[PDB]
Chain A
């Protein structure tokens, strides 16, 4: 319908960096398999925690798993108790040893992934969806330094039978411009009536910064 390519996959050569970074000849399928099982292992407890980014640098078979989140304090509970448990399970599930770096984003409401987190987690929690979005925004519109936003919500909105898509915005979000620095995040709400897939575009600025 809207045949819109994932813009983090449309600027992954130009502005947005890769999330996983190594070099691999004849070891690549194994590094893919470990990358997948690591991201499944970091889905659940960190999606409780407020995860945004999961980068995996990979040096000579050590591993370096780095996570950008919005609360160092739920990811790091008691020191080593909440960190070294998921870290140690990453050390056992992989056949390797894990150096887990955990870091905070300076503003959670201007990460598109974290905006999709807070919006969809509100939308599972029986709030008004036009109020959620509309408050998804107002906040982020701001606050830093953030020249667009565009929120779309499809699915059983309000528990209705029809799957109505909604489309709210403010400012400038140019997708066809490649010097855009757009963050994109889709996260999917889980109501009892079903799943409300939320897409958030956030246009930070014109800046190439090449």
Chain B
């Protein structure tokens, strides 16, 4: 990924809507032996997302690096994924496993900061979280820890969803501090939203 700063007198750079947040996690040239030598190709693990908390995971195969990055962008574009939150935190401590990828995603009080390793830091920095506390146990990789983090975010659910599963009136599903954090986060949603209307 070099020589991107450019000014063209051509038709268009085609800049348009959906200015999302896009992170390229790792690139390892992938070789293939054929008759008389090696054929080098490229893999780019592409994370895309918006600051609401919708995450994509794309996996680009091409024999050029920006081609593989662009194919990962289109593949994560094809496949988004909804993550439920509280304010800008996570709901409750989970462990995700993608066959060797263990990631523990635990919430924290706000202000602490996204503390995670670089793959999980990528998937969570694209997402709508600002203050959680994760760790990547096992598998020491990028692909399995990204995919394990997304499986970990599939083990998430709303407080309300849990209440619904059990047919119980909330209050009765959460404890009270987390309901107060719901009041804080929806209150600042009201303040920034009504400042957004004017």
Contact = CB atoms under 8 A, between A and B. Distances in A.
Interface string B1-26: 01100000000000000000000000
Contacts of B3: 127-128, 131
Interface string B40-68: 00000000000000000000000010000
A43 to B, nearest CB: 29
Interface in A98-131: 127-128, 130-131
Number of chain B interface residues as a range = under 10
Contacts of A130: 64
Contacts, number: 5
B133 to A, nearest CB: 41
B39 to A, nearest CB: 12
Contacts of A127: 3
Contacts of B64: 130
A130 B3 CA distance: 10
B80 to A, nearest CB: 29
Interface string B127-157: 0000000000000000000000000000000
A197 B2 CA distance: 23
Nearest to A131: B3
A131 B8 CA distance: 13
A165 to B, nearest CB: 13
Nearest to A134: B64
A206 B41 CA distance: 34
A127 B2 CA distance: 10
Interface string A123-144: 0000110110000000000000
Contacts of A131: 3
Top 5 A-B residue pairs of the complex, sorted by shortest distance between their CB atoms: A128-B3, A131-B3, A128-B2, A130-B64, A127-B3
5 contacts: A127-B3, A128-B2, A128-B3, A130-B64, A131-B3
Interface of A: 127-128, 130-131
